[PDB]
């Protein structure tokens, strides 16, 4: 199969590396690769993070100074401000380079054309699939972890080797794995999840609550206990990842199995058409445009929805309960 | 009827003219009217074009400078950057004028309100209907060529006279003609063509290819030969422009005539509905809004579509083929 | 893999050939193989053409006489009269043959069963993709040109060799190419083009005109200048055939590209449905029946439509105009 | 204006006329114009009509012979056999003529392209609006009567004069009138009547009968008395033709007027849609195709319908009844 389990690490010995940002991700990658025998420098503005990184032993600079010194760079910062930074400070120095390597953690700002670097550069991609904290909690066992690879522009044929060397330098492999894919094939995923089943689930829960209350005379303090106020859900999401998704149900009763399976094979089509519509809306690039426009307006909708959701009925009752049970 | 065939040229003798931009159009217009007995000056930024115009015997200044010296101006540049230019350099120098004449080549940035000059100015329109190159290939025979005229604001009653004088000064008349119309009546046209039959044609071709392949087991190397890989279309367009649209078919076989006529009179309503929808969407001004917003966003959709189209199935086969026939 | 570029030519040395018809095709196809070192004889009715072919150095006989002498034949005449000819003069003289070869230029009269020759005959197909005139303009460069091959009935296992030898004998190869296919896979093509995008295009243009006029108060003398009275379509088709279909647009503006691409990916479904319907209506053979019937009636619909189309407002306006521009 | 009431008659004095057919129409026009000072000859096959026509004082020849002698001709025969006749006997004798005039009584076989004479000929139309018998019953009062005129092909600028002279030579004017129109504007009419209200009326009557019987227990021997077995209808049509269509109702009772007017303004749209569909089906020429094909088959549908209609229930009841009232 395409999968990869280990590779070399030499192309990054003899060069310097410039890490951008020192948030959750930037901190981890940086340290782990300082351990693997690499020269590392950071680029960031003088703020809280700035003091935190040097303090761990690093020689911290500002951003564009960390690039003139480097032949490689890691742009580990959010996808909402990464654009502006690339045009003001980076773009000129980048133009004034000969052979560079530029890395990302997400393909949003690239796959959709919001960033179009030159052809004198080797562009790559490296995307983990961990929340960011447990990654360290696992590396201390020598464990690896999974990632996604990809490339958009190679001018030396060495892009894949560079990417594998990177994935190795961060403890992801050996021990874990790394897949080959494109940028689109990662943004598509990181969005669909945030668009199809999370909101569907939330709305289904809210609807169960509303119906149980306003049509069957049920107490608000009860529904919550069953639906999500109890950690039964976590128990499900756990056995899912460990024992499997379907084999998980073997631990529950037969009635639950029957109802679940029937109603699952019964509603599979609606969710399918929904997912189709959303994925199509994304593939073309409308959602990026929508989000950028909303940014250009002042996040009005965001405000009103963040209001409505909290000022709903379920949220209030949840408040009294969580208080009554000590839950903060 | 409305049509005009020739008029005077005296109102432009005794004045100066400022031609903005020395691209395809501006170059031609200036080169021509330098011959009809007129003094001409250019305004443009110092780049490739700047060296070319002066090289041809012109005196080249900066844009704002070329206006202080002029009582007339030709704003021959794309409709995508004209706004900022007009707002920064022109607007003040124009406020500091007494009686001016401003000319365009399209009505997009005006008809839709993206430009609202003062009332101390005569605003006009002159729109050819040629690709830009053949205009020279024809003037060398002394021929004329067709144009569209219009006016948005006149404060001296001489606007139409100025417009006719201009159309004469560029060799369009006599020999060709000139029509009277508005700005809307030109943008509407220059858009509808780009919105109704070009894309319908392209999609129909693509669909014929896809169907022929994926449902009848046909070779990709064949369909192209019939549909567009052969220059049969060029002959059709030529006979259209020269002999007539319908009379053209007299040269083809009876079977083709029958099929074409029937299937045309059969599928006329659908395209009519489509065209109605699009023209209505334009008349109000939504398309301009959409385009300006996409500009403000970063042309994501443009990028993704330019990607999909090329990464299609037909394009790859056409690429394999063009290489095979020797076609570059 | 599939395509062919050159082959042998020996099977046609030691044999005679009988060319039927001396119209456009028969004229070119004959001279070239006469040059390539082949004995050639023509069969045609004694009329204008009859004098032309012999005048060029040929020995002209009558059709039935040209077959008794030949072991091979080329039936290069329209698909509307071929049936009677084959049924009256050819079939009788053909029963008393032993090893014959029969060639065509189209598969209409065969693929649809309107002709069912015997089994002692080798039936083949050769279909160029050129207007018929430029083919000779190109052969003088030693060039080749495209063709489609196919077979319906082989009683000697040598049919493909004969077809390749033929294609080589008319200058199409080497220099050009030749594809292997069936009769259907050519009739389907030569029809769909005449059924799907040509009439859709014509109707869309007509509708654009009608709408622009009768709902926005536009002048008839103007719309034409934009839509087709200018040869912009010719430039589009030329760039299509030469550089590519989509890459063609790079020479246009950005607004045009955006509108075109959007409206193309927006309507792809409707035309797909249309094309499906038409291709299905053909595959089964209904259109052939329709056309064979209309002939038995007197071409009434043909007449009425040829009338309506010409007596439309657009045609009258184009007539008033083409006069005004000197166009005959 | 737009109408004619009288005109000259000299262009037809000094010439001969060939009247084809001696049926109801031809007999009348011939007998008449033999009185207005014209030399007349007939062409027809030797049968009853031939003997009758030569008995009435004419000199009779054979059709083809009657044309060599004439410079004008009247083709007064049905529209179902005219084609073969024109193609066999007339066309050959007509190619060798110099300046001819050809007249019709209906535009069916022409307007639809089933006949396409040469260009050295003057083609015209003259269509009365009478059953054929009463025309003589009226002429003997010196009256005129209505006609329709038209032209398809004039090569001498004299057709209209010829047409008026003809309309005069038959006593239709003065006393009557003559209208200007085309061939289409005559066949369209002569068909619509036979397609829209005649069959609608018949079906409505049949339906009233069926409903009255099979849902309200009525006697078959009664309904007929009311619906059409009584001549009440004839009076309505007579008053229509004489006093007017709506003023007619003044003689009936109020209740009738109210119901009629209401249900008339209530059902106007449906019949309008029907008529639109039918007129459109005609204008293009599909009905002619249909009829010619049915002719080419054996008139099966005609037979089956002539059977069904007569073998209905209403017909059997009317047969039992008419016998009971002495009606043959
Ligand atoms: Mg995310
Ligand atoms: Mg344009
Ligand atoms: Mg063809
Ligand atoms: Mg009739």
PDB file of N, CA, C and O in Angstrom, chain B residues 1 129 193-194 196-197 200 202 208 210 226 232-233 240-242 254-258 260 264 267-268 278 290-291 294 302 306 322, chain C residues 129 193-194 196-197 200 202 208 210 221 226 232 240-242 246 254-258 260 264 267-268 278 290-291 294 302 306 322:
ATOM      1  N   UNK B   1     -32.240  55.668 -40.887  1.00  0.00           N
ATOM      2  CA  UNK B   1     -32.448  55.330 -39.485  1.00  0.00           C
ATOM      3  C   UNK B   1     -31.330  55.912 -38.626  1.00  0.00           C
ATOM      4  O   UNK B   1     -30.510  56.694 -39.107  1.00  0.00           O
ATOM      5  N   UNK B 129     -16.101  46.788 -32.026  1.00  0.00           N
ATOM      6  CA  UNK B 129     -16.569  45.407 -32.009  1.00  0.00           C
ATOM      7  C   UNK B 129     -15.565  44.505 -32.709  1.00  0.00           C
ATOM      8  O   UNK B 129     -15.920  43.593 -33.461  1.00  0.00           O
ATOM      9  N   UNK B 193     -23.190  37.572 -24.121  1.00  0.00           N
ATOM     10  CA  UNK B 193     -22.397  36.663 -24.939  1.00  0.00           C
ATOM     11  C   UNK B 193     -21.519  35.775 -24.071  1.00  0.00           C
ATOM     12  O   UNK B 193     -21.388  34.574 -24.328  1.00  0.00           O
ATOM     13  N   UNK B 194     -20.914  36.349 -23.038  1.00  0.00           N
ATOM     14  CA  UNK B 194     -20.028  35.613 -22.151  1.00  0.00           C
ATOM     15  C   UNK B 194     -20.774  34.791 -21.115  1.00  0.00           C
ATOM     16  O   UNK B 194     -20.134  34.193 -20.246  1.00  0.00           O
ATOM     17  N   UNK B 196     -24.287  33.134 -21.916  1.00  0.00           N
ATOM     18  CA  UNK B 196     -25.404  32.326 -22.390  1.00  0.00           C
ATOM     19  C   UNK B 196     -24.972  31.246 -23.381  1.00  0.00           C
ATOM     20  O   UNK B 196     -25.169  30.067 -23.101  1.00  0.00           O
ATOM     21  N   UNK B 197     -24.356  31.601 -24.506  1.00  0.00           N
ATOM     22  CA  UNK B 197     -24.138  30.587 -25.534  1.00  0.00           C
ATOM     23  C   UNK B 197     -22.732  30.010 -25.523  1.00  0.00           C
ATOM     24  O   UNK B 197     -22.557  28.844 -25.887  1.00  0.00           O
ATOM     25  N   UNK B 200     -22.883  27.372 -22.655  1.00  0.00           N
ATOM     26  CA  UNK B 200     -23.788  26.311 -23.088  1.00  0.00           C
ATOM     27  C   UNK B 200     -23.110  25.438 -24.133  1.00  0.00           C
ATOM     28  O   UNK B 200     -23.171  24.206 -24.075  1.00  0.00           O
ATOM     29  N   UNK B 202     -19.836  25.036 -24.693  1.00  0.00           N
ATOM     30  CA  UNK B 202     -18.747  24.275 -24.088  1.00  0.00           C
ATOM     31  C   UNK B 202     -19.285  23.074 -23.319  1.00  0.00           C
ATOM     32  O   UNK B 202     -18.771  21.953 -23.444  1.00  0.00           O
ATOM     33  N   UNK B 208     -21.424  15.693 -24.702  1.00  0.00           N
ATOM     34  CA  UNK B 208     -21.389  14.751 -25.812  1.00  0.00           C
ATOM     35  C   UNK B 208     -20.203  13.813 -25.671  1.00  0.00           C
ATOM     36  O   UNK B 208     -20.335  12.598 -25.848  1.00  0.00           O
ATOM     37  N   UNK B 210     -18.515  12.965 -22.848  1.00  0.00           N
ATOM     38  CA  UNK B 210     -18.714  12.069 -21.715  1.00  0.00           C
ATOM     39  C   UNK B 210     -19.701  10.960 -22.047  1.00  0.00           C
ATOM     40  O   UNK B 210     -19.464   9.789 -21.729  1.00  0.00           O
ATOM     41  N   UNK B 226     -14.179  14.512 -34.243  1.00  0.00           N
ATOM     42  CA  UNK B 226     -15.454  14.959 -34.785  1.00  0.00           C
ATOM     43  C   UNK B 226     -15.888  16.276 -34.160  1.00  0.00           C
ATOM     44  O   UNK B 226     -16.265  17.215 -34.870  1.00  0.00           O
ATOM     45  N   UNK B 232     -13.673  22.218 -38.452  1.00  0.00           N
ATOM     46  CA  UNK B 232     -14.969  22.379 -39.100  1.00  0.00           C
ATOM     47  C   UNK B 232     -15.733  23.571 -38.541  1.00  0.00           C
ATOM     48  O   UNK B 232     -16.437  24.265 -39.284  1.00  0.00           O
ATOM     49  N   UNK B 233     -15.607  23.822 -37.237  1.00  0.00           N
ATOM     50  CA  UNK B 233     -16.317  24.939 -36.623  1.00  0.00           C
ATOM     51  C   UNK B 233     -15.907  26.265 -37.249  1.00  0.00           C
ATOM     52  O   UNK B 233     -16.749  27.145 -37.471  1.00  0.00           O
ATOM     53  N   UNK B 240     -20.970  31.897 -41.619  1.00  0.00           N
ATOM     54  CA  UNK B 240     -21.940  32.690 -40.871  1.00  0.00           C
ATOM     55  C   UNK B 240     -21.664  34.172 -41.071  1.00  0.00           C
ATOM     56  O   UNK B 240     -22.521  34.933 -41.534  1.00  0.00           O
ATOM     57  N   UNK B 241     -20.451  34.601 -40.719  1.00  0.00           N
ATOM     58  CA  UNK B 241     -20.119  36.018 -40.775  1.00  0.00           C
ATOM     59  C   UNK B 241     -20.208  36.567 -42.192  1.00  0.00           C
ATOM     60  O   UNK B 241     -20.527  37.746 -42.379  1.00  0.00           O
ATOM     61  N   UNK B 242     -19.932  35.739 -43.199  1.00  0.00           N
ATOM     62  CA  UNK B 242     -19.850  36.221 -44.574  1.00  0.00           C
ATOM     63  C   UNK B 242     -21.171  36.056 -45.324  1.00  0.00           C
ATOM     64  O   UNK B 242     -21.750  37.039 -45.795  1.00  0.00           O
ATOM     65  N   UNK B 254     -28.676  17.577 -46.806  1.00  0.00           N
ATOM     66  CA  UNK B 254     -30.065  17.744 -46.397  1.00  0.00           C
ATOM     67  C   UNK B 254     -30.306  17.174 -45.007  1.00  0.00           C
ATOM     68  O   UNK B 254     -31.025  17.771 -44.200  1.00  0.00           O
ATOM     69  N   UNK B 255     -29.732  16.005 -44.719  1.00  0.00           N
ATOM     70  CA  UNK B 255     -29.926  15.379 -43.414  1.00  0.00           C
ATOM     71  C   UNK B 255     -29.529  16.325 -42.291  1.00  0.00           C
ATOM     72  O   UNK B 255     -30.258  16.484 -41.301  1.00  0.00           O
ATOM     73  N   UNK B 256     -28.352  16.940 -42.415  1.00  0.00           N
ATOM     74  CA  UNK B 256     -27.899  17.891 -41.410  1.00  0.00           C
ATOM     75  C   UNK B 256     -28.887  19.035 -41.262  1.00  0.00           C
ATOM     76  O   UNK B 256     -29.237  19.432 -40.146  1.00  0.00           O
ATOM     77  N   UNK B 257     -29.336  19.592 -42.387  1.00  0.00           N
ATOM     78  CA  UNK B 257     -30.300  20.684 -42.342  1.00  0.00           C
ATOM     79  C   UNK B 257     -31.541  20.281 -41.561  1.00  0.00           C
ATOM     80  O   UNK B 257     -32.000  21.009 -40.674  1.00  0.00           O
ATOM     81  N   UNK B 258     -32.094  19.113 -41.883  1.00  0.00           N
ATOM     82  CA  UNK B 258     -33.322  18.659 -41.245  1.00  0.00           C
ATOM     83  C   UNK B 258     -33.124  18.502 -39.745  1.00  0.00           C
ATOM     84  O   UNK B 258     -33.886  19.050 -38.936  1.00  0.00           O
ATOM     85  N   UNK B 260     -30.809  19.696 -37.736  1.00  0.00           N
ATOM     86  CA  UNK B 260     -30.520  20.963 -37.081  1.00  0.00           C
ATOM     87  C   UNK B 260     -31.783  21.790 -36.904  1.00  0.00           C
ATOM     88  O   UNK B 260     -32.077  22.265 -35.802  1.00  0.00           O
ATOM     89  N   UNK B 264     -33.521  22.576 -33.331  1.00  0.00           N
ATOM     90  CA  UNK B 264     -33.467  23.964 -32.899  1.00  0.00           C
ATOM     91  C   UNK B 264     -34.854  24.471 -32.542  1.00  0.00           C
ATOM     92  O   UNK B 264     -35.077  24.968 -31.433  1.00  0.00           O
ATOM     93  N   UNK B 267     -35.836  22.942 -29.135  1.00  0.00           N
ATOM     94  CA  UNK B 267     -35.169  23.299 -27.889  1.00  0.00           C
ATOM     95  C   UNK B 267     -35.031  24.807 -27.712  1.00  0.00           C
ATOM     96  O   UNK B 267     -34.069  25.273 -27.093  1.00  0.00           O
ATOM     97  N   UNK B 268     -35.973  25.583 -28.239  1.00  0.00           N
ATOM     98  CA  UNK B 268     -35.851  27.036 -28.233  1.00  0.00           C
ATOM     99  C   UNK B 268     -36.319  27.651 -26.920  1.00  0.00           C
ATOM    100  O   UNK B 268     -35.783  28.676 -26.485  1.00  0.00           O
ATOM    101  N   UNK B 278     -30.689  35.143 -16.916  1.00  0.00           N
ATOM    102  CA  UNK B 278     -29.372  35.770 -16.834  1.00  0.00           C
ATOM    103  C   UNK B 278     -29.453  37.271 -17.088  1.00  0.00           C
ATOM    104  O   UNK B 278     -28.876  38.074 -16.341  1.00  0.00           O
ATOM    105  N   UNK B 290     -21.260  40.452  -7.280  1.00  0.00           N
ATOM    106  CA  UNK B 290     -20.629  39.148  -7.124  1.00  0.00           C
ATOM    107  C   UNK B 290     -19.157  39.194  -7.517  1.00  0.00           C
ATOM    108  O   UNK B 290     -18.285  38.698  -6.793  1.00  0.00           O
ATOM    109  N   UNK B 291     -18.869  39.787  -8.675  1.00  0.00           N
ATOM    110  CA  UNK B 291     -17.501  39.837  -9.173  1.00  0.00           C
ATOM    111  C   UNK B 291     -16.613  40.665  -8.257  1.00  0.00           C
ATOM    112  O   UNK B 291     -15.477  40.272  -7.957  1.00  0.00           O
ATOM    113  N   UNK B 294     -15.875  38.617  -5.116  1.00  0.00           N
ATOM    114  CA  UNK B 294     -14.870  37.597  -5.391  1.00  0.00           C
ATOM    115  C   UNK B 294     -13.483  38.213  -5.487  1.00  0.00           C
ATOM    116  O   UNK B 294     -12.506  37.643  -4.989  1.00  0.00           O
ATOM    117  N   UNK B 302     -12.542  30.977  -8.810  1.00  0.00           N
ATOM    118  CA  UNK B 302     -11.783  31.032 -10.052  1.00  0.00           C
ATOM    119  C   UNK B 302     -10.693  29.973 -10.065  1.00  0.00           C
ATOM    120  O   UNK B 302     -10.543  29.219 -11.034  1.00  0.00           O
ATOM    121  N   UNK B 306     -10.640  26.744 -12.581  1.00  0.00           N
ATOM    122  CA  UNK B 306      -9.513  26.596 -13.492  1.00  0.00           C
ATOM    123  C   UNK B 306      -8.786  25.286 -13.247  1.00  0.00           C
ATOM    124  O   UNK B 306      -8.174  24.730 -14.167  1.00  0.00           O
ATOM    125  N   UNK B 322      -3.066  16.399 -29.142  1.00  0.00           N
ATOM    126  CA  UNK B 322      -2.378  17.553 -29.708  1.00  0.00           C
ATOM    127  C   UNK B 322      -0.886  17.279 -29.832  1.00  0.00           C
ATOM    128  O   UNK B 322      -0.260  17.627 -30.838  1.00  0.00           O
TER     129      UNK B 322
ATOM    130  N   UNK C 129     -12.116  13.231 -41.676  1.00  0.00           N
ATOM    131  CA  UNK C 129     -12.690  14.238 -40.790  1.00  0.00           C
ATOM    132  C   UNK C 129     -12.338  15.632 -41.282  1.00  0.00           C
ATOM    133  O   UNK C 129     -12.015  16.535 -40.508  1.00  0.00           O
ATOM    134  N   UNK C 193     -23.329  15.689 -33.469  1.00  0.00           N
ATOM    135  CA  UNK C 193     -22.883  17.051 -33.732  1.00  0.00           C
ATOM    136  C   UNK C 193     -23.981  17.856 -34.411  1.00  0.00           C
ATOM    137  O   UNK C 193     -24.215  19.022 -34.077  1.00  0.00           O
ATOM    138  N   UNK C 194     -24.668  17.242 -35.366  1.00  0.00           N
ATOM    139  CA  UNK C 194     -25.731  17.906 -36.106  1.00  0.00           C
ATOM    140  C   UNK C 194     -27.040  17.961 -35.336  1.00  0.00           C
ATOM    141  O   UNK C 194     -28.044  18.419 -35.888  1.00  0.00           O
ATOM    142  N   UNK C 196     -27.103  18.293 -31.382  1.00  0.00           N
ATOM    143  CA  UNK C 196     -27.031  18.714 -29.990  1.00  0.00           C
ATOM    144  C   UNK C 196     -26.516  20.144 -29.831  1.00  0.00           C
ATOM    145  O   UNK C 196     -27.238  20.984 -29.303  1.00  0.00           O
ATOM    146  N   UNK C 197     -25.311  20.461 -30.304  1.00  0.00           N
ATOM    147  CA  UNK C 197     -24.749  21.765 -29.963  1.00  0.00           C
ATOM    148  C   UNK C 197     -24.916  22.800 -31.063  1.00  0.00           C
ATOM    149  O   UNK C 197     -25.018  23.992 -30.759  1.00  0.00           O
ATOM    150  N   UNK C 200     -28.594  24.011 -30.571  1.00  0.00           N
ATOM    151  CA  UNK C 200     -28.645  24.720 -29.297  1.00  0.00           C
ATOM    152  C   UNK C 200     -27.991  26.086 -29.427  1.00  0.00           C
ATOM    153  O   UNK C 200     -28.524  27.097 -28.962  1.00  0.00           O
ATOM    154  N   UNK C 202     -27.490  27.893 -32.202  1.00  0.00           N
ATOM    155  CA  UNK C 202     -28.294  28.759 -33.058  1.00  0.00           C
ATOM    156  C   UNK C 202     -29.493  29.314 -32.299  1.00  0.00           C
ATOM    157  O   UNK C 202     -29.788  30.515 -32.361  1.00  0.00           O
ATOM    158  N   UNK C 208     -31.176  35.260 -27.535  1.00  0.00           N
ATOM    159  CA  UNK C 208     -30.495  36.453 -27.052  1.00  0.00           C
ATOM    160  C   UNK C 208     -30.954  37.674 -27.830  1.00  0.00           C
ATOM    161  O   UNK C 208     -31.276  38.716 -27.248  1.00  0.00           O
ATOM    162  N   UNK C 210     -33.805  38.108 -29.642  1.00  0.00           N
ATOM    163  CA  UNK C 210     -35.206  38.412 -29.372  1.00  0.00           C
ATOM    164  C   UNK C 210     -35.380  39.089 -28.020  1.00  0.00           C
ATOM    165  O   UNK C 210     -36.115  40.074 -27.899  1.00  0.00           O
ATOM    166  N   UNK C 221     -29.750  46.841 -35.199  1.00  0.00           N
ATOM    167  CA  UNK C 221     -28.461  47.024 -35.852  1.00  0.00           C
ATOM    168  C   UNK C 221     -27.284  46.801 -34.916  1.00  0.00           C
ATOM    169  O   UNK C 221     -26.149  46.699 -35.393  1.00  0.00           O
ATOM    170  N   UNK C 226     -22.518  42.359 -31.998  1.00  0.00           N
ATOM    171  CA  UNK C 226     -21.909  41.665 -30.873  1.00  0.00           C
ATOM    172  C   UNK C 226     -21.983  40.156 -31.046  1.00  0.00           C
ATOM    173  O   UNK C 226     -20.979  39.455 -30.884  1.00  0.00           O
ATOM    174  N   UNK C 232     -15.515  37.240 -34.195  1.00  0.00           N
ATOM    175  CA  UNK C 232     -14.916  36.794 -32.941  1.00  0.00           C
ATOM    176  C   UNK C 232     -15.070  35.289 -32.756  1.00  0.00           C
ATOM    177  O   UNK C 232     -14.162  34.616 -32.251  1.00  0.00           O
ATOM    178  N   UNK C 240      -9.329  27.412 -30.260  1.00  0.00           N
ATOM    179  CA  UNK C 240      -9.746  26.101 -29.772  1.00  0.00           C
ATOM    180  C   UNK C 240      -8.969  25.008 -30.492  1.00  0.00           C
ATOM    181  O   UNK C 240      -8.297  24.177 -29.872  1.00  0.00           O
ATOM    182  N   UNK C 241      -9.058  25.000 -31.822  1.00  0.00           N
ATOM    183  CA  UNK C 241      -8.451  23.928 -32.600  1.00  0.00           C
ATOM    184  C   UNK C 241      -6.936  23.907 -32.455  1.00  0.00           C
ATOM    185  O   UNK C 241      -6.325  22.834 -32.524  1.00  0.00           O
ATOM    186  N   UNK C 242      -6.312  25.066 -32.253  1.00  0.00           N
ATOM    187  CA  UNK C 242      -4.853  25.137 -32.256  1.00  0.00           C
ATOM    188  C   UNK C 242      -4.258  24.938 -30.863  1.00  0.00           C
ATOM    189  O   UNK C 242      -3.494  23.995 -30.636  1.00  0.00           O
ATOM    190  N   UNK C 246      -9.821  25.089 -23.327  1.00  0.00           N
ATOM    191  CA  UNK C 246      -9.856  25.882 -22.104  1.00  0.00           C
ATOM    192  C   UNK C 246      -8.697  26.867 -22.043  1.00  0.00           C
ATOM    193  O   UNK C 246      -8.893  28.037 -21.697  1.00  0.00           O
ATOM    194  N   UNK C 254     -10.485  38.410 -17.327  1.00  0.00           N
ATOM    195  CA  UNK C 254     -10.791  37.570 -16.178  1.00  0.00           C
ATOM    196  C   UNK C 254     -12.293  37.476 -15.949  1.00  0.00           C
ATOM    197  O   UNK C 254     -12.814  36.395 -15.661  1.00  0.00           O
ATOM    198  N   UNK C 255     -12.995  38.606 -16.051  1.00  0.00           N
ATOM    199  CA  UNK C 255     -14.447  38.609 -15.907  1.00  0.00           C
ATOM    200  C   UNK C 255     -15.095  37.588 -16.831  1.00  0.00           C
ATOM    201  O   UNK C 255     -15.982  36.825 -16.421  1.00  0.00           O
ATOM    202  N   UNK C 256     -14.690  37.594 -18.100  1.00  0.00           N
ATOM    203  CA  UNK C 256     -15.226  36.634 -19.056  1.00  0.00           C
ATOM    204  C   UNK C 256     -14.976  35.209 -18.590  1.00  0.00           C
ATOM    205  O   UNK C 256     -15.880  34.366 -18.613  1.00  0.00           O
ATOM    206  N   UNK C 257     -13.742  34.916 -18.182  1.00  0.00           N
ATOM    207  CA  UNK C 257     -13.412  33.583 -17.697  1.00  0.00           C
ATOM    208  C   UNK C 257     -14.333  33.175 -16.559  1.00  0.00           C
ATOM    209  O   UNK C 257     -14.875  32.066 -16.541  1.00  0.00           O
ATOM    210  N   UNK C 258     -14.524  34.077 -15.597  1.00  0.00           N
ATOM    211  CA  UNK C 258     -15.318  33.758 -14.419  1.00  0.00           C
ATOM    212  C   UNK C 258     -16.759  33.461 -14.802  1.00  0.00           C
ATOM    213  O   UNK C 258     -17.313  32.415 -14.439  1.00  0.00           O
ATOM    214  N   UNK C 260     -18.050  32.686 -17.710  1.00  0.00           N
ATOM    215  CA  UNK C 260     -18.131  31.498 -18.547  1.00  0.00           C
ATOM    216  C   UNK C 260     -18.037  30.233 -17.711  1.00  0.00           C
ATOM    217  O   UNK C 260     -18.883  29.342 -17.822  1.00  0.00           O
ATOM    218  N   UNK C 264     -20.993  27.596 -17.048  1.00  0.00           N
ATOM    219  CA  UNK C 264     -20.739  26.307 -17.674  1.00  0.00           C
ATOM    220  C   UNK C 264     -20.969  25.173 -16.690  1.00  0.00           C
ATOM    221  O   UNK C 264     -21.717  24.232 -16.973  1.00  0.00           O
ATOM    222  N   UNK C 267     -24.915  24.748 -15.816  1.00  0.00           N
ATOM    223  CA  UNK C 267     -25.928  24.242 -16.733  1.00  0.00           C
ATOM    224  C   UNK C 267     -25.567  22.884 -17.321  1.00  0.00           C
ATOM    225  O   UNK C 267     -26.302  22.375 -18.173  1.00  0.00           O
ATOM    226  N   UNK C 268     -24.458  22.287 -16.886  1.00  0.00           N
ATOM    227  CA  UNK C 268     -23.961  21.073 -17.526  1.00  0.00           C
ATOM    228  C   UNK C 268     -25.001  19.959 -17.519  1.00  0.00           C
ATOM    229  O   UNK C 268     -24.957  19.056 -18.362  1.00  0.00           O
ATOM    230  N   UNK C 278     -31.203  12.367 -27.101  1.00  0.00           N
ATOM    231  CA  UNK C 278     -30.982  12.318 -28.544  1.00  0.00           C
ATOM    232  C   UNK C 278     -30.165  11.092 -28.940  1.00  0.00           C
ATOM    233  O   UNK C 278     -30.511  10.376 -29.889  1.00  0.00           O
ATOM    234  N   UNK C 290     -37.539   8.090 -39.428  1.00  0.00           N
ATOM    235  CA  UNK C 290     -38.147   9.401 -39.631  1.00  0.00           C
ATOM    236  C   UNK C 290     -37.691  10.023 -40.944  1.00  0.00           C
ATOM    237  O   UNK C 290     -38.509  10.458 -41.767  1.00  0.00           O
ATOM    238  N   UNK C 291     -36.377  10.071 -41.155  1.00  0.00           N
ATOM    239  CA  UNK C 291     -35.834  10.724 -42.341  1.00  0.00           C
ATOM    240  C   UNK C 291     -36.215   9.973 -43.608  1.00  0.00           C
ATOM    241  O   UNK C 291     -36.518  10.591 -44.634  1.00  0.00           O
ATOM    242  N   UNK C 294     -39.924  11.019 -44.295  1.00  0.00           N
ATOM    243  CA  UNK C 294     -40.133  12.370 -44.804  1.00  0.00           C
ATOM    244  C   UNK C 294     -39.852  12.464 -46.296  1.00  0.00           C
ATOM    245  O   UNK C 294     -40.534  13.207 -47.011  1.00  0.00           O
ATOM    246  N   UNK C 302     -39.443  20.235 -43.948  1.00  0.00           N
ATOM    247  CA  UNK C 302     -38.249  20.909 -44.440  1.00  0.00           C
ATOM    248  C   UNK C 302     -38.607  22.246 -45.072  1.00  0.00           C
ATOM    249  O   UNK C 302     -38.001  23.280 -44.771  1.00  0.00           O
ATOM    250  N   UNK C 306     -37.533  25.879 -43.531  1.00  0.00           N
ATOM    251  CA  UNK C 306     -36.706  26.754 -44.351  1.00  0.00           C
ATOM    252  C   UNK C 306     -37.401  28.082 -44.599  1.00  0.00           C
ATOM    253  O   UNK C 306     -36.738  29.111 -44.768  1.00  0.00           O
ATOM    254  N   UNK C 322     -25.947  43.218 -43.795  1.00  0.00           N
ATOM    255  CA  UNK C 322     -24.915  42.662 -44.662  1.00  0.00           C
ATOM    256  C   UNK C 322     -24.808  43.459 -45.953  1.00  0.00           C
ATOM    257  O   UNK C 322     -23.715  43.631 -46.501  1.00  0.00           O
TER     258      UNK C 322
END
